[PDB]
């Protein structure tokens, strides 16, 4: 879950 | 010491530069004129939005209008998250607790930020090229007639502050670490950064506007006003979800909005 948050924040 | 926070309020305010395209600065020059540039294309009406069509970017009109709001909060939320990234210490925090923190305060920021770009009548829009009235917003359609007018009532009394952008980069990253938020896992390490944060605020707010005395005092009342508009906004919300079928809710919004108030 959050993955598109997990992904700007791991970026 | 107090050399040590304002290092902090200049890396601070030279991220925000870098993280928010359009500024404080700027959307006050455009709407009192003082800029040389093409003034906005003024979006009044039903027609008047037709004819702005060339100088904005992308089935009927209070939902679209909504999901030109959705487009653009999806990029707030993208410049807040690299906003947040630049905050020291931020990124060392456990990464579930991170996105927690995002979660709760983006709207909080947007909000905040919006308000930059208001005056009582409207609101520029695609970086400051169109300028959505005020009344025009009222007059869509329920639910959509009531969605921007707490917006805009709240961001004229934080605008009678008269903060400036090196107050709102520090003012926007106490409120991203927040520790109250539900469901943090690691409490302490937030409060340590917002407690440096608050001095920070603290220092720039007397520095920066020494005739003005407990503006740090106000400010802080309205971080609780935020959290209102952002409460009676999540159930709004929960109501266009519901009450409207032709339109779907961007996928971030919806990571952010479920399991939120
Ligand atoms: C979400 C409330 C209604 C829609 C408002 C969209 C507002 C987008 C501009 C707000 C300022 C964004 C802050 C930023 O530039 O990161």
């Known amino acids: 879950r959050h993955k598109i948050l997990h992904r700007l924040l791991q970026e | 010491e107090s050399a040590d926070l304002r290092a902090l309020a200049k890396h601070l305010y030279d991220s925000y530069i870098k993280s928010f395209p359009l500024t404080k600065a700027k959307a006050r020059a455009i709407l009192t004129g003082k800029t040389t540039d093409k ?7 039903m027609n008047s ?5 060339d100088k904005i970017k992308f089935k009927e009109v209070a939902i679209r209008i909504f999901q030109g709001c959705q487009f653009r909060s999806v990029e707030a939320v993208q410049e807040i998250t690299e906003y947040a990234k630049s905050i020291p210490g931020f990124v060392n925090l456990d990464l579930n607790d991170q996105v ?4 709760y305060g983006v709207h909080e920021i947007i909000y905040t930020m919006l308000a930059s770009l208001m005056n009582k009548d409207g609101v520029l829009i695609s970086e400051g090229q169109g300028f959505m009235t005020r009344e025009f917003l009222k007059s ?3 639910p959509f007639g009531d969605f921007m007018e707490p917006k805009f009532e709240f ?16 003012f926007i990253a106490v409120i991203i670490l927040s520790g109250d938020r539900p469901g943090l896992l690691n409490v302490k ?24 005395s407990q503006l740090f005092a106000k400010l802080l009342q309205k971080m609780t006003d935020l959290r209102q ?10 109501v266009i979800k519901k009450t409207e079928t032709d339109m ?6 919806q990571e952010i909005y479920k399991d939120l108030y």
Request: proline fraction near 5%; charged fraction near 25%; avoid cysteine.
């Open chain 2, 140 to 142: 869509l359609r329920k």
């Open chain 2, 189 to 212: 390490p937030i409060e340590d950064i917002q407690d440096n944060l608050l001095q920070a605020l603290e220092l720039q707010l007397k520095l920066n506007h020494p005739e003005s």
């Open chain 2, 100 to 103: 927690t923190l995002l979660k």
């Open chain 2, 155 to 170: 961001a004229v009394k934080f605008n009678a502050l008269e903060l400036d952008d090196s107050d709102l980069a520090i």
């Open chain 2, 49 to 53: 939005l037709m004819m702005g069509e």
């Open chain 2, 248 to 253: 779907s809710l961007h996928p971030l919004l």
């Open chain 2, 39 to 45: 003034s906005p294309f003024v979006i009044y009406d």
């Open chain 2, 229 to 238: 508009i952002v409460t009676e906004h999540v159930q709004l919300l929960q």
